[PDB]
């Protein structure tokens, strides 16, 4: 039958000194299976369920590398949004991202997700057609404009269409 995989990433800037608080959590069907936390004693990806401990050590290392990579991405783009919305340098803000795939019974992609939110408001999201973007406001249109010119929709669609579906298949087997 149908299956799904979702990843939720959130970065929250803090007043005062200190980098943003970043968190990443993944879900299979609707069960948390992986999690990363920047404010952890040992920041790294870790299994949340027994059937995830069967992944090689190198699996969790390179995947934790993506975390650090994603974390820096959220750091740089939190600053970009402060300028787009002309916000005071003194405040807390949260940039969020959700991405994933739903797979039908035939094993093929049923629906793909790639959407971002800023301070609890939708910013930009990949439409179900996986070809166009919905830009909530004028600031989002700056991003959408540059993403249409760079063919970002196809880029993300490639992942959702292949890797997302393939890894969901693997996880379900284990």
């Amino acid at each position: 039958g149908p299956h799904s995989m979702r990843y939720y990433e959130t970065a929250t800037s803090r007043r005062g000194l200190g980098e943003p608080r970043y968190t990443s959590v993944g879900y299979v069907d609707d069960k948390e299976f992986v999690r990363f936390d920047s404010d952890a004693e040992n920041p790294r990806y870790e299994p949340q369920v027994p059937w995830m401990e069967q992944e090689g050590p190198e699996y969790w290392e390179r995947i934790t590398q993506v975390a650090k990579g994603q974390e820096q991405w959220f750091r740089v783009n939190l600053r970009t949004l402060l300028g787009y919305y002309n916000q005071s340098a003194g405040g807390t803000h949260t940039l969020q991202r959700m991405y994933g795939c739903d797979v039908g019974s035939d094993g093929r992609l049923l629906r793909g997700y790639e959407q971002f939110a800023y301070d609890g408001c939708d910013y930009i999201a990949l439409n179900e057609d996986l070809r166009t973007w919905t830009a909530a406001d004028m600031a989002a249109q700056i991003t959408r404009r540059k993403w249409e010119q760079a063919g970002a929709a196809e880029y993300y669609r490639a992942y959702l269409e292949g890797e997302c579906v393939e890894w969901l298949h693997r996880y379900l087997k284990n």
Partner: peptide
Amino acid sequence: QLSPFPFDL
């Protein structure tokens, strides 16, 4: 596996 790094906003 995780998706590739997204383009910049």
